[PDB]
Design an enzyme around this catalytic site. Structure first.
Site, short mmCIF file in Angstrom:
data_model
loop_
_atom_site.label_atom_id
_atom_site.label_comp_id
_atom_site.label_asym_id
_atom_site.label_seq_id
_atom_site.Cartn_x
_atom_site.Cartn_y
_atom_site.Cartn_z
N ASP A 46 0.18 -8.01 1.71
CA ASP A 46 0.46 -6.58 1.65
C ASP A 46 1.95 -6.27 1.67
OD1 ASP A 46 -0.11 -3.82 1.59
OD2 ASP A 46 -0.19 -3.70 3.79
N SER A 53 4.81 1.70 8.21
CA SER A 53 4.58 0.54 7.34
C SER A 53 5.76 0.14 6.48
CB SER A 53 3.38 0.77 6.43
OG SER A 53 2.19 0.76 7.19
N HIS A 82 0.80 -1.21 0.00
CA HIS A 82 0.00 0.00 0.00
C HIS A 82 0.84 1.27 0.00
CE1 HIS A 82 0.44 -0.07 4.50
NE2 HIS A 82 0.37 1.24 4.34
#
Lengths: 206, 202, 211
Positions: free
Chosen positions: B85, B151, B55
């Site tokens: 992800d 992230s 993402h």
């Protein structure tokens, strides 16, 4: 050779005794209405939890980390301290929470909060004891609460706050959520000395 | 009152010096007349392969990687896995690269002290401390404060060994409160696994 | 049986430092005597003479500044001066009994990853100790803080902690906590800041002699 810094020893000694507590209601076939945590205090199957976790439940379910699930009986509660006692009947031996009646909690002691926040499964958070009560009048309206910065979320109530040794320090209560600033790392627990007392009474009287 | 001059402060600096150099700032850049998203990544080996979140790099015109030592590289996207992800990046390895310590035989244990390493709110590389709160969620759960910008970054133990790749925090709120200290990471063994497939299938 | 083992603890740091961290109240008038609390923060007693370091924001526009020690003593503080450039303020209290002071080791160098304890009075709950680590010691490039010497920590900081102390496991002053970074967009978790202690000592001394 070298080993990572860890609080796994305390986890292995105390986590097996902390259980997920499910409050179920009529629905109208039953469903989960309230969720929480609880601590197995004795071999006979007595478990401590918060009163607001099991209020007006038609069936209380207790799930242990080893996989066992039991229907629990409400032995009694106490609103002044928001503590309740449950009773389960197992065949195989029950894991109990380590308790050192003579251990005295100190500000700055490393602690682990053990519970089932948001029903994600047993969770362990780490912090320290921020305070062991207050002498004067304060916003909590109480004088014997343990304050900690170990992350506490909905679902943690009735769960255990243990030290680096796995010894019970107290029972976590509802978390401090709004002011309306967003408080960070401010949680409370009923001191274990007070939880044992209230339990013995409730078991034999209340 | 007293003398603490020769006493030694409790610290996780050893893990920082060993792991932080291999954790990079990942910038997703776009056209405007600019940074669209930003995250972190972990340099996995000398070949120049990097792990990050899918993402963080989706729909990017240019992906920039920045090392703590000052160097900046343009990265090519090698592959991503919708399911976990994760995403693999590739930069030029000529000139040597700092790599993240990996102990393939180390098994993460609930209660192990962990440090989250990333670039939250683009404040600059940040180190946060917590513990492994749970495993098999196949995700590791941690209470090491994680924020937007973390992230794709690393979760390492006190020895600096990689435990996993940070993803997102828990957002579900019932009565309207904010979840505290609930973050997830993909266990290092599995991430390594995905990377190998992504590289191979590329 | 753990009866003989010792629980991991930072109680030593708390006992050495906490006694010197005070609660600071900013009181002003209101509707119709009538002196109420308008703002609240923390402070650190830096010297036996009674000089206290706090944040400017807390003591701005105060009709009366009150300082309360953990031993129960309450005093009226004197504003010695402020440094807008760092949001630091120096206060003075006149006590007869003798004052507890913060452990200061001028040769200690803060390292990223060091365990730290934040001491203050969040939400007027009374002195609270939280635990974290130093996340960063200054920044080399341009960054959202707009400065280069801030200490960053993930020790939970809340409204009330400002002007309070950040110490290491030895109880040594690492810095003075600033206002808590409350809002982005999202709501930040574990991101707080502090003025490094060496910088706070210089600012204090100058304000004392000059203004």
């Amino acid at each position: 050779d070298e080993t990572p810094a860890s609080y796994n020893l305390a986890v292995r000694r105390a986590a097996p005794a902390v259980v997920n507590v499910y409050n179920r209601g009529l629905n109208t076939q039953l469903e989960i209405r309230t969720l929480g945590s609880g601590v197995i205090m004795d071999q006979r199957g007595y478990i401590i939890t918060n009163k607001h976790v099991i209020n007006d439940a038609d069936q209380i379910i207790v799930a242990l980390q080893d996989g066992r699930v039991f229907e629990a009986l409400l032995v009694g509660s106490d609103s002044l301290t928001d503590l309740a006692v449950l009773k389960i009947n197992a065949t195989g031996g029950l894991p109990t929470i380590p308790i050192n009646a003579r251990r005295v909690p100190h500000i700055g002691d490393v602690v682990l909060a053990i519970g089932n926040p948001y029903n994600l499964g047993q969770t362990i958070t780490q912090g320290i004891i921020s305070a062991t009560g207050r002498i004067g009048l304060n916003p909590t309206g109480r004088q014997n609460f343990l304050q900690t910065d170990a992350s506490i979320n909905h679902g943690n109530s009735g769960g255990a706050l243990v030290n680096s040794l796995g010894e019970l320090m107290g029972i976590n209560t509802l978390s401090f959520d709004k002011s309306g600033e967003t408080p960070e790392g401010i949680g409370f627990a009923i001191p274990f000395q007070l939880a044992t007392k209230i339990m013995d009474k409730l078991i034999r009287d209340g």
